[PDB]
Amino acid sequence: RFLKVKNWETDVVLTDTLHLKSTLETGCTEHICMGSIMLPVRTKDQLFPLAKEFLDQYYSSIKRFGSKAHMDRLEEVNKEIESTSTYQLKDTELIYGAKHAWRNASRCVGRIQWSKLQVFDARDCTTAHGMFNYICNHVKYATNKGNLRSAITIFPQRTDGKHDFRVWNSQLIRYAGYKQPDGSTLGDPANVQFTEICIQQGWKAPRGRFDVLPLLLQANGNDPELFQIPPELVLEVPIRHPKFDWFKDLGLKWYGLPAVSNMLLEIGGLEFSACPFSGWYMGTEIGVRDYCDNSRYNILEEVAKKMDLDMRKTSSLWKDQALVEINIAVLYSFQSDKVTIVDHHSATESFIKHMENEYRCRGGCPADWVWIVPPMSGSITPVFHQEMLNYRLTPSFEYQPDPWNTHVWKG
Amino acid sequence: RFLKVKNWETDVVLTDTLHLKSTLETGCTEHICMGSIMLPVRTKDQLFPLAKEFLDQYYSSIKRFGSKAHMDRLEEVNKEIESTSTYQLKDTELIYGAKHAWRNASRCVGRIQWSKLQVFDARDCTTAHGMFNYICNHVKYATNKGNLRSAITIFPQRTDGKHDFRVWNSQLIRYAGYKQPDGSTLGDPANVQFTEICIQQGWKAPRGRFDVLPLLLQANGNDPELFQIPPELVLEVPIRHPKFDWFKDLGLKWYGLPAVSNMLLEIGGLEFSACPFSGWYMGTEIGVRDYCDNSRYNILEEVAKKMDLDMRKTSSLWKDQALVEINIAVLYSFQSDKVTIVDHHSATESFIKHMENEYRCRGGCPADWVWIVPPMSGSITPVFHQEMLNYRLTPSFEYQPDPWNTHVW
Ligand code: HEM
Ligand code: HEM
Ligand SMILES: CNCCc1cc(C#N)cc(OCc2ccc3c(C)cc(N)nc3c2)c1
Numbered sequence: 001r002f003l004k005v006k007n008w009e010t011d012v013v014l015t016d017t018l019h020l021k022s023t024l025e026t027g028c029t030e031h032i033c034m035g036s037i038m039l040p041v042r043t044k045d046q047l048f049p050l051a052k053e054f055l056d057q058y059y060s061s062i063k064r065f066g067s068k069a070h071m072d073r074l075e076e077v078n079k080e081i082e083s084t085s086t087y088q089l090k091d092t093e094l095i096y097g098a099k100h101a102w103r104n105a106s107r108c109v110g111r112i113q114w115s116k117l118q119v120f121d122a123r124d125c126t127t128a129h130g131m132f133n134y135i136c137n138h139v140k141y142a143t144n145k146g147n148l149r150s151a152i153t154i155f156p157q158r159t160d161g162k163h164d165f166r167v168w169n170s171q172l173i174r175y176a177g178y179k180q181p182d183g184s185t186l187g188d189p190a191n192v193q194f195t196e197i198c199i200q201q202g203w204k205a206p207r208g209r210f211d212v213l214p215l216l217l218q219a220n221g222n223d224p225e226l227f228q229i230p231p232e233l234v235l236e237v238p239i240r241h242p243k244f245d246w247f248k249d250l251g252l253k254w255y256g257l258p259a260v261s262n263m264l265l266e267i268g269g270l271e272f273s274a275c276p277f278s279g280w281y282m283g284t285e286i287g288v289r290d291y292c293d294n295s296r297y298n299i300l301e302e303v304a305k306k307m308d309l310d311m312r313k314t315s316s317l318w319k320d321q322a323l324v325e326i327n328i329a330v331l332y333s334f335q336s337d338k339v340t341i342v343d344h345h346s347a348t349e350s351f352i353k354h355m356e357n358e359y360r361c362r363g364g365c366p367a368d369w370v371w372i373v374p375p376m377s378g379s380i381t382p383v384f385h386q387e388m389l390n391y392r393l394t395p396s397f398e399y400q401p402d403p404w405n406t407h408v409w410k411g
Numbered sequence: 412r413f414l415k416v417k418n419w420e421t422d423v424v425l426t427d428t429l430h431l432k433s434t435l436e437t438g439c440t441e442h443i444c445m446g447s448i449m450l451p452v453r454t455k456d457q458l459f460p461l462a463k464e465f466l467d468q469y470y471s472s473i474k475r476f477g478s479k480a481h482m483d484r485l486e487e488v489n490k491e492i493e494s495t496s497t498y499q500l501k502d503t504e505l506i507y508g509a510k511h512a513w514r515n516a517s518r519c520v521g522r523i524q525w526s527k528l529q530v531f532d533a534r535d536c537t538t539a540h541g542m543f544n545y546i547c548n549h550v551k552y553a554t555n556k557g558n559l560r561s562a563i564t565i566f567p568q569r570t571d572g573k574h575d576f577r578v579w580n581s582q583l584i585r586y587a588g589y590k591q592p593d594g595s596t597l598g599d600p601a602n603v604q605f606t607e608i609c610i611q612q613g614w615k616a617p618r619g620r621f622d623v624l625p626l627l628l629q630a631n632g633n634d635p636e637l638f639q640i641p642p643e644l645v646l647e648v649p650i651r652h653p654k655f656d657w658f659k660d661l662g663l664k665w666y667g668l669p670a671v672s673n674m675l676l677e678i679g680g681l682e683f684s685a686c687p688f689s690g691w692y693m694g695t696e697i698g699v700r701d702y703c704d705n706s707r708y709n710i711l712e713e714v715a716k717k718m719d720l721d722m723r724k725t726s727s728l729w730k731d732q733a734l735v736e737i738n739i740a741v742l743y744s745f746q747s748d749k750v751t752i753v754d755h756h757s758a759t760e761s762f763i764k765h766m767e768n769e770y771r772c773r774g775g776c777p778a779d780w781v782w783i784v785p786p787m788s789g790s791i792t793p794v795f796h797q798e799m800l801n802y803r804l805t806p807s808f809e810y811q812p813d814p815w816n817t818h819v820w
């Protein structure tokens with residue numbers, strides 16, 4: 001069964017055969033599409049097929065399919081599942097798994113870079129302090145004084161689900177949010193809940209509009225612990241605008257390293273519940289979502305005011321106008337400080353090339369249009385007129401429940 | 412199986428029960444989502460369940476479900492089908508059918524106005540000249556001197572597929588597209604092929620670039636005929652900018668009346684191949700789409716150039732900045748000339764209200780996030796953080812092959 005996607009801007013057609021390798025499910029049916037829904041304990045019974053499938057993939061990619069090396073490895077993993085009810089990945093396997101999880105991440109516009117991931121194996125870690133140490137080295141290596149480098153750090157896999165490693169932060173670096181008594185929010189509204197947890201766990205909040213949050217780290221199923229990333233490791237960029245001198249006076253800055261830490265890495269049935277990964281920012285992530293979203297910093301209005309915009313009628317597009325300027329300033333700031341950033345035009349063009357290259361050498365590229373198209377200027381980026389097929393491949397990154405909702409407290 | 416959708420900006424949760432009454436298919440499966448794909452004759456046995464399904468919802472909507480009247484009409488249609496192999500809608504059913512075809516159009520952000528559709532029954536029409544007349548009356552009524560009103564005009568239903576009524580234009584009003592020897596195009600690149608087909612069938616093009624295309628009308632499956640819409644019926648808006656008075660000299664205008672004419676309307680099994688319908692523009696449909704789309708006017712370059720923006724690297728966001736000004740202007744021009752137009756903030760906010768309404772009174776509202784989200788500034792509109800469920804209800808508007816690929820000549 002061959003499937004076709006058309007680019008309606010260039011009439012280019014591609015043929016997806018890769019969707020047949022799809023194991024997981026979308027949530028869609030023949031009678032309903034859940035394409036815009038954000039979100040749609042493992043026994044040896046269903047593990048070896050998941051293991052076998054992964055090892056078949058791996059040994060295929062290294063062109064050793066059905067070799068004695070391949071067959072012994074299967075046999076070896078089998079006996080280990082038979083006797084220990086889990087199994088350990090070799091280093092080569094882990095690296096492959098991490099890179100393909102990213103490659104398979106259908107909502108990621110930045111996957112042209114997937115094969116250049118720096119994989120830190122932290123499977124020997126046993127304590128939160130050791131987690132803190134691995135994360136510091138990640139941040140330092142990834143940041144690289146502004147010349148950002150893709151990296152992922154992988155903590156030990158889940159076992160009986162009672163001894164999980166978790167990074168409780170949604171990102172390694174993120175600013176606090178404080179609900180004031182009068183209903184207003186100081187800092188980043190997105191992080192109010194997590195801030196409160198941290199504070200309960202004994203964090204001394206400076207209560208400023210741009211305080212870096214502490215790391216809240218859980219090793220081996222134990223209660224999480226608070227650590228402060230060394231300020232000198234957190235690279236930040238003051239936000240100014242190239243024509244607007246008053247923009248600097250808005251007092252804004254943002255951190256340079258986007259590093260997501262609350263997801264789950266699945267490789268051959270194994271689950272890595274703590275697997276922080278990082279790349280670099282597309283400008284709109286900060287400028288459109290992190291400032292202008294109504295449930296965020298919402299400087300939108302204050303930027304509009306200082307531009308002396310007609311803020312009466314929305315048909316003046318003052319909202320649209322301020323949004324462009326804020327994204328202009330975000331790109332301007334990061335470039336001026338030689339901190340790696342990409343604009344949404346560059347990233348989408350790059351992705352289209354990636355996708356075509358993927359269809360030719362892999363027979364497909366799973367892609368989530370709803371998430372790949374940029375949150376501003378959609379139709380003037382080339383992904384907008386690009387049909388995309390969405391399906392789920394393993395290895396993968398998955399969502400998992402917030403740890404504070406599932407964790408059993410030791411004391 | 413009582414599905415829930417969440418707004419992530421507001422945490423409002425709605426529960427969708429209406430999707431269980433879905434008949435048609437989406438194109439997706441458990442293994443693959445086709446949510447971004449643009450495009451995924453009836454026997455007696457196929458027809459009657461379709462008729463019954465339609466008549467059942469009709470009589471429920473008028474609170475006379477299971478009534479003598481209901482049962483009367485069911486037997487009545489049933490008998491006509493076994494005899495004539497088809498049937499005819501009562502006027503009331505036609506109006507209900509049409510309005511609900513709009514209500515169910517999951518890709519339409521304008522559906523809050525769905526019940527105020529003006530239906531023009533054109534089923535007595537027999538010729539292209541007749542179609543032209545019904546269409547001129549539609550255009551004039553809809554336009555209403557700039558105060559636009561929704562309308563649909565419905566021509567005879569398909570019979571045996573050889574007697575089809577078809578409006579060959581994609582819209583009633585659209586500018587011509589001529590490609591120059593030079594290489595590029597002038598007029599409107601989307602219409603290049605059709606502009607050729609008109610000339611190919613005898614149109615004499617004014618080869619300016621805002622030349623309103625002729626109508627190409629097909630009655631009862633005959634060869635189609637060219638007709639020129641009276642210019643005084645074609646309301647146009649000169650495009651100026653409220654702050655940049657160099658903008659006027661770009662020489663741009665657009666027509667006030669968006670009127671889609673190539674879709675098929677399906678009611679209780681019956682197929683209306685000619686059914687032009689019209690409302691009023693969302694600003695972005697002309698500015699983010701009919702000016703800057705690289706496969707159309709693509710005047711972005713020209714605009715930024717005499718905004719003298721730094722067009723050296725994409726990271727200056729000059730395209731974005733220009734895109735916004737063009738759209739500010741479109742809105743400004745229409746409002747200035749008192750021609751109806753809605754901005755993308757207003758329409759999306761309207762739709763959220765409409766959506767809530769439909770969950771409340773109907774139990775659901777099929778919606779295609781990929782088309783509902785405007786082509787600019789998506790994330791600062793309320794629909795962006797709105798989860799939506801997409802499914803196919805009937806009555807519906809559907810796509811159909813372009814006539815020139817089909818029509819036996
Ligand atoms: C190197 C430059 C990268 C860029 C520019 C980039 C860009 C993006 C953007 C803009 C999104 C949409 C998220 C949103 O708007 O909320 C996204 C999603 C995602 N990215 Fe990438 N990314 C990069 C690197 C990476 C890396 C290194 C990984 C993993 C190792 C990764 C994995 C993912 C995943 C799993 C998602 C889906 C999130 C979800 O399902 O909620 N990305 N990316
Ligand atoms: C009155 C104001 C209206 C507004 C503002 C509006 C807005 C829109 C917009 C922005 C689209 C996106 C399509 C594109 O960008 O190319 C759309 C699609 C659509 N509209 Fe509405 N519309 C209106 C009235 C109507 C009426 C009166 C009908 C029919 C009774 C209708 C039926 C449809 C259908 C069927 C589609 C999708 C066609 C497809 O599946 O490709 N609309 N509309
Ligand atoms: C406004 N969107 C918030 C929704 C969201 C949820 C989760 C989770 N869990 C993770 C998310 O992250 C997406 C993502 C992941 C990794 C990224 C990397 C490595 C770099 C980058 N520039 N953006 C990313 C973006 C987003």
Ligand SMILES: CNCCc1cc(C#N)cc(OCc2ccc3c(C)cc(N)nc3c2)c1
Nearest residue numbers: 669670671673674688689690691692693810
């Ligand atoms: C660039 N996208 C083109 C895809 C498209 C195809 C067809 C068809 N056939 C019909 C389409 O119609 C969209 C539409 C239909 C009716 C509208 C009405 C009545 C009013 C309005 N403002 N926009 C409409 C927009 C679109």
Ligand SMILES: C[C@H](O)[C@H](O)[C@H]1CNc2nc(N)[nH]c(=O)c2N1
Nearest residue numbers: 008384385386387447448781782
């Ligand atoms: C490929 C892509 O899905 C397709 O071009 C769609 C995307 N969203 C759209 N949205 C609107 N409003 N109009 C369109 O024509 C499209 N085109």
Ligand SMILES: C[C@H](O)[C@H](O)[C@H]1CNc2nc(N)[nH]c(=O)c2N1
Nearest residue numbers: 036037038370371795796797798
């Ligand atoms: C409801 C909606 O699907 C949800 O808010 C999605 C839409 N598209 C998105 N796209 C990106 N890049 N990031 C997001 O967080 C979202 N959110």
Ligand SMILES: [Zn+2]
Nearest residue numbers: 028033439444
């Ligand atoms: Zn789907």
